[PDB]
Amino acid sequence: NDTEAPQVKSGDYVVYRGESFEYYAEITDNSGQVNRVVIRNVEGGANSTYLSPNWVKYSTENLGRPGNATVQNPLRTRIFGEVPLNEIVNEKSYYTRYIVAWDPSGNATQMVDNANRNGLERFVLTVKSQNEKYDPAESSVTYVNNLSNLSTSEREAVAAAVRAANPNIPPTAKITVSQNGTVTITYPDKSTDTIPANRVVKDLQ
Ligand SMILES: [Ca+2]
Ligand code: NA
């Protein structure tokens, strides 16, 4: 007499080359119980569990127990992995995937191929370049002798000030500064952010 499938809440799952990610989806059922969770590509029919890319992993604690999937304490599925440096992106790449859960009566969440289900049982995994994860602080001011001709010492000073203001940028990202004070941050995936000189340097001319 339970003919209602488990309901899923996911999110906007943005991930970044060279970075780990972790998201948690939430699942409830009217019976209070969920016995199985699969995350999958749309194709392949009812028995398919195929999911790509292969670096997308998931796990669900406490399956198959009474009351493991209620509104007050939803079942949670960890969706996680490590994005390779060699993923192809433009600004981004999209992968649309589905979370299917089963209750004890065998009712399974239905896959509906429509963007108006995104954030429920359907989610978009958006892969972005590494630069997009970081918003470099354009706080810091380095006084130089002449804004049109920074010395090596002045360029190193600017780079050190940018690093000190940005502890969360990847340690192995490379901060370089040109002879006019323009800052380039080159991330491990070789994408870049740039900071115009007038946000980091001044002179007294
Ligand atoms: Ca149900
Ligand atoms: Na950025």
Swiss-Prot record:
Disruption phenotype: Loss of bacterial-mediated red blood cell hemagglutination, no bacterial adhesion to glycoconjugates with alpha-2-3 sialic acid termini. No longer aggregates human platelets. Bacteria no longer bind human fetuin. Bacteria bind less well to human platelets. Triple sspA-sspB-hsa deletion no longer causes human platelet aggregation; a single hsa deletion aggregates platelets normally. Significantly reduced binding to human glycocalicin (GP1BA, the shed form of platelet glycoprotein Ib alpha). No change in platelet spreading on S.gordonii. The protein is glycosylated in vivo; constructs without SR1 and SR2 are not glycosylated. It is found in: Secreted, Cell wall. Residues 1-205 are annotated as: Non-repeat region 2 (NR2). Belongs to the serine-rich repeat protein (SRRP) family. A cell wall protein involved with PadA in host cell interactions required for colonization and pathogensis. Mediates hemagglutination and adherence to ghst glycoproteins. Recognizes fetuin-A (AHSG), a highly glycosylated human plasma protein, also involved in recognition of human platelets, probably via platelet glycoprotein Ib alpha (GP1BA). Acts in concert with PadA to promote binding to glycosylated human fibronectin (FN1) and vitronectin (VTN), and biofilm formation. Plays a major role in fibronectin and vitronectin binding; binding is mediated by glycosylated regions. S.gordonii, a commensal oral cavity bacteria, is among the bacteria most frequently identified as being the primary etiological agents of subacute infective endocarditis (found in 13% of cases). Has a short (SR1) and long (SR22) Ser-rich region separated by 2 non-repeats regions (NR1 and NR2). SR2 is comprised of 113 inexact repeats of SASTSASVSASE. SR2 is thought to extend about 0.2 um away from the cell surface. SR1, NR2 and SR2 are essential for Hsa-mediated hemagglutination and for binding to sialoglycoconjugates (fetuin and NeuAc-alpha-2-3Gal-beta-1-4(Glc)-HSA); removal of the N- or C-terminus of SR2 (residues 448-1459 or 1092-2143 respectively) still allows binding and hemagglutination. This is Streptococcal hemagglutinin. It comes from Streptococcus gordonii (strain Challis / ATCC 35105 / BCRC 15272 / CH1 / DL1 / V288). The gene is hsa.
